[PDB]
Amino acid sequence: FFNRIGGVQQDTILAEGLHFRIPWFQYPIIYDIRARPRKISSPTGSKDLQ
């Protein structure tokens, strides 16, 4: 819930479904709950310093 006056309503998260919002005043920001994989390569040294 992002309202131009208030800011992000850090408060309430809206679930799936059809909702009511005030045009121009409020912007919904939709984020995905889905799990996603990410691979990060990292070079690092061990205790032996290799």
Structure tokens at 8: 């992000």
**3 CB-near residues (< 8 Å, 6+ apart):** 9, 25, 26, 27
Structure tokens at 9: 């309503």
Structure tokens at 7: 């800011």
**28 CB-near residues (< 8 Å, 6+ apart):** 1, 2, 14, 19, 21
Method: cryo-EM
Alpha-carbon dihedral 31, 34, 35, 38, rounded to 10 degrees: -50
Residue 34 burial class via C-beta count within 10 angstroms: exposed 0-12, middle 13-18, buried 19 and up:
exposed
